[PDB]
Design an enzyme around this catalytic site. Structure first.
Site, PDB file in Angstrom:
ATOM      1  CG  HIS B 358      40.816  39.266  36.322  1.00  0.00           C
ATOM      2  ND1 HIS B 358      41.771  38.763  37.176  1.00  0.00           N
ATOM      3  CD2 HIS B 358      41.468  39.617  35.190  1.00  0.00           C
ATOM      4  CE1 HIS B 358      42.947  38.794  36.578  1.00  0.00           C
ATOM      5  NE2 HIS B 358      42.791  39.314  35.376  1.00  0.00           N
ATOM      6  CE  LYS B 549      37.857  40.795  51.977  1.00  0.00           C
ATOM      7  NZ  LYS B 549      38.347  39.806  50.964  1.00  0.00           N
ATOM      8  NE  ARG B 550      37.901  50.036  46.062  1.00  0.00           N
ATOM      9  CZ  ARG B 550      38.000  50.647  44.886  1.00  0.00           C
ATOM     10  NH1 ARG B 550      39.094  50.552  44.155  1.00  0.00           N
ATOM     11  NH2 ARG B 550      36.973  51.355  44.429  1.00  0.00           N
ATOM     12  CE  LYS B 555      36.181  42.744  46.787  1.00  0.00           C
ATOM     13  NZ  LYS B 555      37.008  41.508  46.628  1.00  0.00           N
ATOM     14  CB  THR B 657      45.181  38.104  45.881  1.00  0.00           C
ATOM     15  OG1 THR B 657      44.666  39.443  45.759  1.00  0.00           O
ATOM     16  CG2 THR B 657      45.214  37.416  44.511  1.00  0.00           C
ATOM     17  CE  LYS B 661      47.639  40.745  48.566  1.00  0.00           C
ATOM     18  NZ  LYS B 661      46.971  42.058  48.347  1.00  0.00           N
TER      19      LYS B 661
HETATM   20  C1  LIG Z   1      45.748  42.183  48.011  1.00  0.00           C
HETATM   21  C2  LIG Z   1      44.983  43.464  47.931  1.00  0.00           C
HETATM   22  C3  LIG Z   1      43.664  43.520  47.456  1.00  0.00           C
HETATM   23  C4  LIG Z   1      42.866  42.293  47.021  1.00  0.00           C
HETATM   24  O1  LIG Z   1      42.182  41.856  48.188  1.00  0.00           O
HETATM   25  P1  LIG Z   1      40.906  40.837  48.138  1.00  0.00           P
HETATM   26  O2  LIG Z   1      40.541  40.587  49.578  1.00  0.00           O
HETATM   27  O3  LIG Z   1      41.371  39.553  47.526  1.00  0.00           O
HETATM   28  O4  LIG Z   1      39.828  41.529  47.380  1.00  0.00           O
HETATM   29  C5  LIG Z   1      43.021  44.753  47.396  1.00  0.00           C
HETATM   30  N1  LIG Z   1      43.666  45.911  47.803  1.00  0.00           N
HETATM   31  C6  LIG Z   1      44.963  45.869  48.264  1.00  0.00           C
HETATM   32  C7  LIG Z   1      45.638  47.146  48.705  1.00  0.00           C
HETATM   33  C8  LIG Z   1      45.633  44.658  48.327  1.00  0.00           C
HETATM   34  O5  LIG Z   1      46.926  44.616  48.783  1.00  0.00           O
HETATM   35  C1  LIG Z   2      37.282  42.486  37.718  1.00  0.00           C
HETATM   36  C2  LIG Z   2      38.150  42.328  38.941  1.00  0.00           C
HETATM   37  O1  LIG Z   2      38.781  43.267  39.413  1.00  0.00           O
HETATM   38  N1  LIG Z   2      38.175  41.093  39.459  1.00  0.00           N
HETATM   39  C3  LIG Z   2      38.987  40.676  40.600  1.00  0.00           C
HETATM   40  O2  LIG Z   2      40.220  40.132  40.108  1.00  0.00           O
HETATM   41  C4  LIG Z   2      41.090  39.538  41.080  1.00  0.00           C
HETATM   42  C5  LIG Z   2      42.366  39.045  40.394  1.00  0.00           C
HETATM   43  O3  LIG Z   2      42.163  37.829  39.689  1.00  0.00           O
HETATM   44  C6  LIG Z   2      40.389  38.407  41.843  1.00  0.00           C
HETATM   45  O4  LIG Z   2      41.266  37.911  42.855  1.00  0.00           O
HETATM   46  C7  LIG Z   2      39.084  38.907  42.453  1.00  0.00           C
HETATM   47  O5  LIG Z   2      38.397  37.797  43.014  1.00  0.00           O
HETATM   48  C8  LIG Z   2      38.210  39.633  41.416  1.00  0.00           C
HETATM   49  O6  LIG Z   2      37.127  40.304  42.057  1.00  0.00           O
END
Ligand SMILES: *Cc1c(COP(=O)(O)O)cnc(C)c1O
Ligand SMILES: CC(=O)N[C@@H]1O[C@H](CO)[C@@H](O)[C@H](O)[C@H]1O
Ligand SMILES: Cc1cccc(Cl)c1NC(=O)Nc1cc2ccccc2cc1C(=O)N[C@H](C(=O)O)c1ccccc1
Ligand SMILES: Cc1cccc(Cl)c1NC(=O)Nc1cc2ccccc2cc1C(=O)N[C@H](C(=O)O)c1ccccc1
Ligand SMILES: *Cc1c(COP(=O)(O)O)cnc(C)c1O
Ligand SMILES: CC(=O)N[C@@H]1O[C@H](CO)[C@@H](O)[C@H](O)[C@H]1O
Ligand SMILES: Cn1c(=O)c2c(ncn2C)n(C)c1=O
Ligand SMILES: Cn1c(=O)c2c(ncn2C)n(C)c1=O
Lengths: 800, 811
Positions: B358, B549-550, B555, B657, B661
């Site tokens: 990942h 996102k985190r 990011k 992901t 969304k």
């Molecule tokens: C979908 C989702 C993420 C993943 O988001 P990315 O922008 O792809 O890092 C993280 N936290 C929550 C609560 C989500 O629903």
């Molecule tokens: C180690 C880890 O949490 N990796 C995360 O995994 C998700 C699910 O595949 C990816 O969408 C994302 O880009 C990546 O940062």
């Protein structure tokens, strides 16, 4: 009704357990039945709460650190009248209800008599229709599971909630904050207790069904949780989360001491935790009531709080704190209301049991309560000085503070001054409490001190544990005795009814056969069916003198060995009970008993004449098995040491004869049944005092009594521990030089009395005639009688 | 779905109301006169669970009867969110339950809002597991999720004086109506001890035992008869000194499942974390083997149970390297317990396991010190060493004169402190290795694990991530789901590629207005929430510009913040100039120990305070730090979004992901050519995304040249102004030096080259504002994004795993 029970069972197996019967477990079936049974009391549970709200009876709050409840399933079935129909439903489903009942963990949330009294009381209060709630702690771990390893007690955690508890409902909505530590400011808007640490109290409710009535009361037990809210006063994040365990530790485990004070800070936290949550809850319910000319004038007309021993003594200063600091009542009014609210039950005069908390510990943990306690004491001592201007020593004697070096709070004194009524638990005890131990207090307030002789519930302790006997009695005199046990006096009409006496004997025999199967399964000792079952089950204590019984066992053994052809009345001697983990002498006594048992049971010259069992893991559910199987009940505490006893009553109700001292409620059992119908022996309380005056020299008895000398020499020289000949040196040393309970002083009389028991046991007519007189005289010892007395003379409430 | 009209539909609703009332009475033990909203939530939850029990039991029976090959998804995280509405929807019960609750005089939104998130994950990795469970159930695969039942999930975030503070996520406080404890399936897990090499063989002795108690949560397929299981393990002290302290010390065993490690894409080598990883693996593998032995494929010969058919009946997917210990544990069971020859056991092991990588960020890679592993898991260290030896022996045979290749390919990093490379362990122990988007899987195969993929050219695969259209459209955006159904039917739910049918409405102004109206409805509802929680007046005509996102350096929330300040300065310089109004929302949790992420949050809140309260700005621009971003909140903000910010440095975001969304829910994307953004551009057409900045080769070129941040600062006047303001105290007047660490990072230690993408990013943003002023053009582009989002269904993803990795068939 059988058809619907089966349907309900199957619905719960499916929806509640989420199991197809093809993969269901015995535990699954137990839970499906438990839920089926609980469902049958929910309507009355809800309607009982509505009734109390609608009609505003005065409420009784029984506040205890212990509720020794045992198992709930069978008790609930019996009290709702469902047992026979459930038995049949489960049978038709291809199962055995007795097997399912064995799955249930005991709610072992107590140590012994004190905790079991609370349990019997809940049952009685519900059966009498009193608006009564039990308040306690939901310990994650109750009294330890006892195993015996190499003849020694070993403790295992009592993980009773591992698979869940179908008899409780969490109510996190009613969660309340409890405060600790912090500091006090005396501001111009009142005294403030600030900068505290908070622990949350989450209540769990368990239903308490009355016997065959419309009442289902509640036992509300509190569980500790860490608070969630960020405080600006707020390190490693992970450790911070793990450290939530420290708050939650307050309700983790029951302190396993019976009649013994251990001044640990965690125990003090437990005591304040239960008191603070309970009083807040009570006040909340009071304010929400139709009584909720200031708010609290009606409080003691609507609320009684009974203190089970001094363990919840902090309730007194807590209620004052709430009244004064929160509700803004003047001290004088608050104090009036407090006294009218509280009553205190004293359960022992043994000094090692007395709660005396260091003032430094209370100052740190509960600074505002220490202030309140000092003020109660000041106003108290001001009065005494006013009435006895010269008596300097009386001030010292009556103070809530003991100043002798390490200053300590006498919690009994706090309970006395803060309560309108103080009771002991048997006539002999209540007299000692009033006229000796708290003489200074009773002289000033004579009407405060009372007696309320203990009792046991005839539901769990007859209908449940001994259905054969309950049936036989019912067949002869009807079932009114269940709700009024004094009706057992009608059985006196059947003295001389030889067919009835045979029926009575057969019930005992069937009980003995069933318990013998348990014994052979668990211990792989071969039980003689015609032996007298001689039983001493209770917590292991020097004062209860299991050791004296052990001396008699060895005496019997030596008699058999010295004259193998002589007539010997066979016995199965059963001794069981837990020792407090830190109680060295009790642990040594257990090892002595198991060591003796090993020699006696394996001596081929003894054989079926005498077998000895240390009955492991003694607890409420096991008491229900052994008590109905017992012929001779051992109640042999040193005169003046057992406040009441209640095991004594259980045995009497179930068709055992009693060998005992004139101690606690044994005295009243003799009064009810006639002294000639008990095997009473030994020093009376005055004889003990005379020996104390003269000085007790154990050596004199050892020198004068050849049979005692051989017994003691065997123990001392390795006869019962050949690989470790000096193993029992601590017991021997105690017996000769530090025996507060005078084992040797009662040995001669005890053995002579035992000889008379064996003689009577050879005459079944005479034996069973005496048994009938005991059962017929046991009616006083119903806890329904006890509760009626508390209701009339302490709480001012009416059975309904 | 279940009808509410007619004889039968009236009875359906009537039954649901009766069941509700029955639970309130018998389960909650409450008279309605004293019932709380929470009580009503539970009564409904219990009612809904009751409705899938039949299918749950029959699913288990079906798998036992027909013995399909089983898929076990092994993960340290399942980011499940709330379960009530998802379950109602998937069972076809939402309309009926809605009606029942309404007839009872209750507000079903209020009941739904009572439920705690099951926040047992950090972000994308954990949420992917959750989407996968939904898709695997919907496709009828015999699939279980296996994880840990953490007492505390991801912390609740609050903002105090502009900083993140953490509160414990006590999600089980009021109980969990979804789960069912299964006491009888409790298993022992061993720790510490030592290895004895004896005449009877190798024994792991003197160990400490912790019990693993499983809790099962139902996983309902969408509108089918499948209810799969998520089994989560909880740690308990065994049954079997100060007695009291001995009892209290049982907390130490129970600490293993106490709390989720709150690190996203970051390795913290804590002993407790290693215990968690072994705990889940050991309990899971024992349970899988027990089920196998109980099956119709369970059989015994002279040695005992034949495990020959094991990999034909079992596939275990390793979600990242976190459950890597599953490889040596299966070997330990096969060799030490079942006495299989090593060679045979290793062959079976490889056929059983597949590994999903990942991330390629080095700080995320698990490298456990061998001394820690020797202490906790001495037999596993032995097994790992023996796997390594036989692995390297083969490499020596193939490449006798390549000594560095041995160093590169070893499972053990030998330099200084010896560490175990868990990724290397996963590669050798698995038959398939996949990355999570085309760009990432290529890096994994051709760069990061080049030595391995050259040796085994068919092992490495791509499986592009996806999201479930149940939670992420039907549930979170009923307005959009309804509109789509009205236009093209409801078959898209189970075949999302059907969204391409929306291209029939290109240039249909009625539809383009309908699309805008749905977005507006979502925006108004979400704005009510914002104004309740925050001191802001939201401009309802503003573009909702959202980055959730985190919080991470990679990011680049920091890049977004620079643009926000840039916009602010433009308004101040020219207050009468036309400005397309925006609400800029940035949200996400920072790992508690991640200093730079915590500084970035403080910067964002500090900027927000200035921007939101400057009267010269007013309704042109508002900034919100969206607190406590988590799955249930994502379901609210995503459907309200116009512009989705996906601006990671090229090469750093494996897939993403959130991007998907936002695309499904009618936002346009501003982003780099990173992760799955590249594939979103492929599907929708690059002209229909706002793509900007360095591509992966440009980043490589800049690394080679050497990145000098100050060059951009000196060359770009607007950047200089922004940076000087931050550095000088414009956003922290009471503490002028507050952001020193941010400035030092940006100038001297920025691995993510924020300044290098600044110019392109701001120019790209200018294009966004221009399009937003043309609703027809804007919504035409939205249509093309929604219509092309079908590839990103996790149903597509799972079908590919099933076919190419697990060898199972949708049913
Ligand atoms: C979908 C989702 C993420 C993943 O988001 P990315 O922008 O792809 O890092 C993280 N936290 C929550 C609560 C989500 O629903
Ligand atoms: C180690 C880890 O949490 N990796 C995360 O995994 C998700 C699910 O595949 C990816 O969408 C994302 O880009 C990546 O940062
Ligand atoms: C709904 C559910 C989900 C998960 C686990 C269980 Cl135990 C249950 N309940 C249940 O009833 N399970 C089964 C019902 C069956 C009915 C008919 C025929 C077979 C059945 C099998 C199960 C079942 O779950 N069996 C488990 C399993 O497959 O996980 C099985 C049982 C004993 C040891 C190992 C595995
Ligand atoms: C069975 C039961 C046992 C303990 C607690 C509850 Cl909440 C319940 N359930 C319950 O329904 N309680 C009540 C039902 C009522 C129905 C009609 C009228 C009054 C009712 C009161 C209760 C009730 O228990 N109320 C509590 C209480 O008396 O303990 C009350 C409510 C709010 C604050 C303080 C006390
Ligand atoms: C009744 C009972 C007791 C109290 O017995 P005493 O002989 O009065 O000390 C203790 N333990 C259990 C389990 C009981 O049932
Ligand atoms: C402190 C304590 O546990 N006391 C015990 O209380 C019970 C119940 O009153 C008595 O029967 C018993 O004699 C006495 O030892
Ligand atoms: C000396 N001692 C103890 O040490 C003890 C005890 N009960 C528990 N403990 C530890 N009792 C009754 C006791 O007499
Ligand atoms: C330096 N660092 C951390 O310290 C960190 C982190 N995530 C959590 N922590 C603690 N990340 C992503 C990080 O780069």
């Amino acid at each position: 009704n059988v058809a619907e029970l089966k349907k309900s069972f199957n619905r719960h197996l499916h929806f509640t357990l989420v199991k197809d019967r093809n993969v269901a477990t015995t535990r699954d079936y137990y839970f499906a039945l438990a839920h089926t049974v609980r469902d049958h009391l929910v309507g009355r549970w809800i309607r009982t709460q509505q009734h109390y709200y609608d009609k505003c009876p005065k409420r009784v709050y029984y506040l205890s650190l212990e509720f020794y409840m045992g198992r709930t399933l069978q008790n609930t079935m019996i009290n709702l009248g469902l047992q026979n129909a459930c038995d049949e439903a489960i049978y038709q489903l291809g199962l055995d209800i007795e097997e399912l009942e064995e799955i249930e963990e005991d709610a072992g949330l107590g140590n012994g008599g004190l905790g079991r009294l609370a349990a019997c009381f809940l049952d009685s209060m519900a059966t009498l229709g009193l608006a009564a709630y039990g308040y306690g702690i939901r310990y994650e771990y109750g009294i330890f599971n006892q195993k015996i390893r190499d003849g020694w007690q070993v403790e295992e955690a009592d993980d009773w909630l591992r698979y869940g508890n179908p008899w409780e409902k969490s109510r996190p909505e009613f969660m309340l904050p409890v405060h600790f530590y912090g500091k006090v400011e005396h501001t111009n808007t009142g005294t403030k207790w600030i900068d505290t640490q908070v622990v949350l109290a989450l209540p769990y409710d368990t239903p308490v069904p009355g016997y065959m009535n419309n009442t289902v009361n509640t036992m509300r037990l509190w569980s500790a949780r860490a608070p969630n809210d960020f405080n600006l006063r707020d390190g490693d994040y992970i450790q911070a989360v793990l450290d939530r365990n420290l708050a939650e530790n307050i309700s983790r485990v029951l302190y396993p001491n019976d009649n013994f004070f251990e001044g640990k800070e965690l125990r003090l936290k437990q005591e304040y935790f239960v008191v603070a949550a309970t009083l807040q809850d009570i006040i909340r319910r009071f304010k929400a009531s139709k009584f909720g000319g200031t708010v609290f004038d009606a409080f003691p007309d609507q609320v009684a709080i009974q203190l089970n021993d001094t363990h919840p003594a902090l309730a007194i200063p807590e209620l004052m704190r709430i009244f004064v600091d929160i509700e803004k009542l003047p001290w004088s009014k608050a104090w009036e209301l407090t006294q009218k609210t509280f009553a205190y039950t004293n359960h022992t005069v043994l000094p090692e049991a007395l709660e005396r908390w260091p003032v430094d510990l209370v100052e740190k943990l509960l600074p505002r309560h220490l202030e309140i306690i000092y003020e109660i004491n000041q106003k108290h001592l001001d009065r005494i000085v006013a009435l006895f201007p010269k008596d300097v020593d009386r001030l010292r004697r009556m103070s809530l503070i003991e100043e002798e070096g390490s200053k300590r709070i006498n919690m009994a004194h706090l309970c006395i001054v803060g309560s309108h009524a103080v009771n002991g638990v048997a006539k002999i005890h209540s007299d000692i409490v009033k006229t000796k131990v708290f003489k200074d207090f009773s002289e000033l307030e004579p009407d405060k001190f009372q007696n309320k002789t203990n009792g046991i519930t005839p539901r769990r302790w007859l209908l449940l544990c001994n259905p054969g006997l309950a049936e036989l009695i019912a067949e002869k005199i009807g079932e009114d005795y269940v709700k009024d046990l004094s009706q057992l006096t009608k059985l006196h009409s059947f003295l001389g009814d030889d067919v009835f006496l045979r029926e009575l004997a057969k019930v005992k025999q069937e009980n003995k056969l069933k318990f013998s199967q348990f014994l052979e399964t668990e211990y792989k000792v071969k039980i003689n069916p015609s032996s007298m079952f001689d039983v001493q089950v209770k917590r292991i204590h020097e004062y209860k003198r299991q050791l004296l019984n052990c001396l008699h066992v060895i005496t019997m053994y030596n008699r058999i060995k010295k004259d193998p052809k002589k007539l010997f009345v066979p016995r199965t001697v059963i001794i069981g009970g837990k020792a407090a983990p830190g109680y060295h002498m009790a642990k040594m006594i257990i090892k002595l008993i198991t060591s003796v048992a090993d020699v006696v049971n394996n001596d081929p010259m003894v054989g079926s004449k005498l077998k000895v069992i240390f009955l492991e893991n003694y607890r409420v559910s096991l008491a229900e098995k052994v008590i109905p199987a017992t012929d001779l009940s051992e109640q042999i505490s040193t005169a003046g040491t057992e406040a009441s006893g209640t095991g004594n009553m259980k045995f009497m109700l179930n068709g055992a004869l009693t060998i005992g001292t004139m101690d606690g409620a044994n005295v009243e059992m003799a009064e009810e049944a006639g002294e000639e119908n008990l095997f009473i022996f030994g020093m009376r309380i005055d004889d003990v005092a005379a020996l104390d005056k003269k000085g007790y020299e154990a050596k004199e008895y050892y020198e004068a009594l050849p049979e005692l000398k051989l017994v003691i020499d065997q123990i001392d020289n390795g006869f019962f521990s050949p690989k470790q000949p000096d193993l029992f040196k601590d017991i021997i040393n105690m017996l000769f030089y530090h025996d507060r309970f005078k084992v040797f002083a009662d040995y001669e009389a005890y053995v002579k009395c035992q000889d008379k028991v064996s003689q009577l046991y050879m005459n079944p007519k005479a034996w069973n005639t005496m048994v009938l007189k005991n059962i017929a005289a046991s009616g006083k010892f119903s806890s329904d009688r006890t509760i009626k007395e508390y209701a009339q003379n302490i709480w001012n409430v009416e059975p309904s």
